[model samples]
Target chain A: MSQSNRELVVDFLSYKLSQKGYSWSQFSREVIPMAAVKQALREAGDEFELRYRRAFSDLTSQLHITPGTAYQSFEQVVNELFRDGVNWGRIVAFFSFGGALCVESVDKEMQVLVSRIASWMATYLNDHLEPWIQENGGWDTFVDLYG
Target chain B: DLRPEIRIAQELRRIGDEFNETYTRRVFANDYR
Candidate 1:
């Protein structure tokens, strides 16, 4: 992809992720690390190695992966990894497991966190990703649908 | 004509509008008290 296209995807994904419940603050702190991982993938010429290292770092950090952010990131990564032709069943199952894990980790204070994340995911899907998916032909079309 | 503070203010206003349009509706709809 061209630099402009890559930047557009990053910006769009950022907005969609925020709509999915990541505060700009949280995105800067918690989620940028994952974006850094993607940056590494783009720059390193080794997708598997970078993804593996990032996943390990995530496990070690036990970063508070809000379901919305987690799912959004998962979707973005999967789409990019597969060049927008993702294995829906695998990605959905992965997010489902991650969502369950997130739900299981909540305390009273984290209840708000959970709620915000859920709202974010809903808004992301409704306002951004879903429309993009539909416009690009149901997540299978790969016409470089970036602006 | 370009000032950093002015840019920040404008961005904040835009964000406020987005919050009002996107988030405030849900808040009002789900308000229980």
Candidate 2:
């Protein structure tokens, strides 16, 4: 077996979150229980790490968080990413995980933390990651490899 | 059925998602601006 796509995606997202000192265990705490959603995430896992890296680079350099500002920036970035079409399904799964992470912030009353995360992920998925996936065989390619 | 803690955790997912839906609509709605 090459590697479990589920573990790979978990590791990839964990790495991204940990870069900001976010907790993977904390994130997994919530995500693991949602059987339906969790399975959905795993289905997207095949191309996740590749997408994460591309998304991470575009986000870390220029992204900043302010509740008011971040949300619009997120929409714009994702919309722009849609310039060439996208696997919106993948984007949604990626952001659903992002949303799960935001719930942790909400727990801390870290208001606007959600927007910051949302922006990074939405922008990264559509703008940076999806294009690459679409070009280089897309998720179907992933399915063949990791399916 | 989810436990309280599970529900609490799941709620965050909802918050993030709702934020996306609402804000995307709000921002796009103003696209004519």
Candidate 3:
């Protein structure tokens, strides 16, 4: 998968940040389907996000993330979450966790952390999960199964 | 016909939009939930 695919998933998970004048319909019809691969991953991701809501919220409440150590704390939490294994569902939860973190940051008026959170997630995906994703038929197969 | 995942993804994103609007409308605070 490409970095653009990662960004697309990040954008959907963090849709709140883009809701201002954002057109989900236009996006889905125009942008989403065009990125067919990302669109499929997006669907699988939505399933995971819904299934793991409670877990994501619990982790969100328990952790205290600040700009000073956001990257370190995120890596620690993600590593633990993936300690057992990595699946599409779990990967979606990772993005959901980041989205929740960004929302909390906005609520607390620390908007600056939102961008940082996205960056951290993208970095983690690239560094840690890309290999596994590629090994498992990459995103095209994901589209075939869930798209 | 639309795929189930696409249906759900659209709905969820719609809800997120509503939540974001609600959040902006709120003028209150709480410790936690």
The parts of candidate 3 lying over 4 Å away from their true place are: A16-34, A58-61, B1-33
- lDDT of each residue in A1-147, candidate 3, tens digit only: 466645654566457444322222212121244378656555644555565455445333455556776666667666765665565545555666666667666666666776677767777788888888788766554454455
Model 1 score (lDDT):
0.34
Model 2 stretches with alpha carbons more than 4 Å out: A1-37, A43-47, A50-54, A58-61, A88-111, A115-147, B1-33
CAPRI level of candidate 1: incorrect
lDDT tens readout by residue for model 2, A39-126: 4445443334344333333231233434555455445544443444344343443444454445445544564565456446644655
* TM-score list, all predictions: 0.28, 0.34, 0.63
User: Which residue pairs come into collision in candidate 2?
Assistant: none
For residue B31, model 3's alpha carbon misses the true position, in angstroms, by: 49
Per-prediction DockQ comes to: 0.02, 0.02, 0.02
Better of 1 and 2 by lDDT: 2
lDDT of 2: 0.44
TM-score of chain A of each: 0.32, 0.39, 0.73
